[PDB]
Amino acid sequence: GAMEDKVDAIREAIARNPQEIFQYVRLSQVKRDDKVLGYRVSPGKDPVLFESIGLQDGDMAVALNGLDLTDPNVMNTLFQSMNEMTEMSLTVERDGQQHDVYIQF
């Protein structure tokens, strides 16, 4: 009950300031031969949000709100655009299997 309420209070703050999502969901580039495969996703300031979205440790994001995360320049665009979005749809590869996960702010 209290974790759900805490997750709702984080979401509300993200809704008001979407870049705050990056305090909770950390992305770190994965490369193979100098090509970016995507971003390893890990929990940030309070892991409850990362957990609530359906993310697990070791997941690699390959698409985010329709942005192809193999594009070496796309992070520029992601950050420029985040404050304009009201959800995050993520496609992650998890032990070699893709999953779509979702949070509406």
Q: Please say whether the dihedral angle defined by the alpha carbons of residues 13, 27, 74 and 68, taken in this order, is positive or negative.
A: negative
Residue of 17, 91, 13 whose CA lies nearest to 46: 13
* Rounded CA separation 104/87 (Å): 4
Domain chopping of the chain, boundaries: 1-105
Contacts for 75-81 with beta carbons within 8 Å, 24 or more apart? Answer: 75/27, 79/19
* Experimental structure resolution, Å: 1.9
Topology annotation, domain 1-105: Pdz3 Domain (2.30.42)
Method: X-ray
